[PDB]
Amino acid sequence: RLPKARFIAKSGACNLAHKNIREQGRFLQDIFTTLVDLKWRHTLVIFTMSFLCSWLLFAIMWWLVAFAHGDIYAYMEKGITEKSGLESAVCVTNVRSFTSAFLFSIEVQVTIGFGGRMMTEECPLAITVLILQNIVGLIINAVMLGCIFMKTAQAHRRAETLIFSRHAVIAVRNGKLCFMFRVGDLRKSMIISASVRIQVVKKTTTPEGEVVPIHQQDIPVDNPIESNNIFLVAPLIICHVIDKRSPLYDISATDLVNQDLEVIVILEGVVETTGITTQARTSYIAEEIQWGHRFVSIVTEEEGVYSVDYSKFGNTVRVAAPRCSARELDEKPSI
């Protein structure tokens, strides 16, 4: 019940499906690659989750370190203020509860250090865990800071916005046929070194056995200097005449109603503000190829300055066209 498989959906996104793949694995370096690029919703969570985790973990470590040295006994049980004089043997001055260890870990890692919970020189394990906690805190801090700067570097690029018309046409220009779509642009910055390429996708057997299933020929776009470049501010019409060398040369008015054609168009180039290459692609199955229809004039010189009227981006009007073939039209004068 499904329609013929399309090579490229209207929103680019070549929908091929590679199977029989020699699946390597992950290498555990994939996680960091994913982490550097997340939607901002998450990178205000993994920040909080990392900081809060590390804090709590080192808090429990301080709790056990103090607990096993007998400090908590000396604080809790012995006299509160007067009946007891500290033996100075304590490991971490004035941390007599878990919450105290939390308010010590925060101090020891966010570099606050209020100074009501000092580090004495008795318990060597305490100094060891202090070195370890400080090192871990710095490593996490640098990684998170670099992640935040990376996700502030990519605030310029948003999305490829280059708009091709819905359905193409085929008309008459200078006594010869053609085939036209309509490219366009939206945002402020122009394109730089823009290029256009037209490929026709077909299943073309050969007289020598080979039958390439999905094979893609390239066809030229009309231009008086044979250069595939284009400089666009208002929408252009990148025509591509048909001739004996061209593959569409055997197309027909009625056969196109049931035919296997696939004219993908790709457009490449950079943008001045971003300074990043980019490209956009689309395809035109036979069902959305009209005939005789030509595109409409869109630019009208108003009183002050030129105006491009997007109101009729893809509107088409019928005009004279012959129902014969390209080879019929070019076969003979009388033809």
């Binding site: 029989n20 793949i21 020699r22 699946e23 390597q24 694995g25």
Partner: peptide, 11 residues
């Protein structure tokens, strides 16, 4: 020191 052989599994 393991073969670490890779075989894909069918749907």
């Amino acid at each position: 020191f393991f073969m670490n052989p890779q075989k894909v599994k069918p749907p």
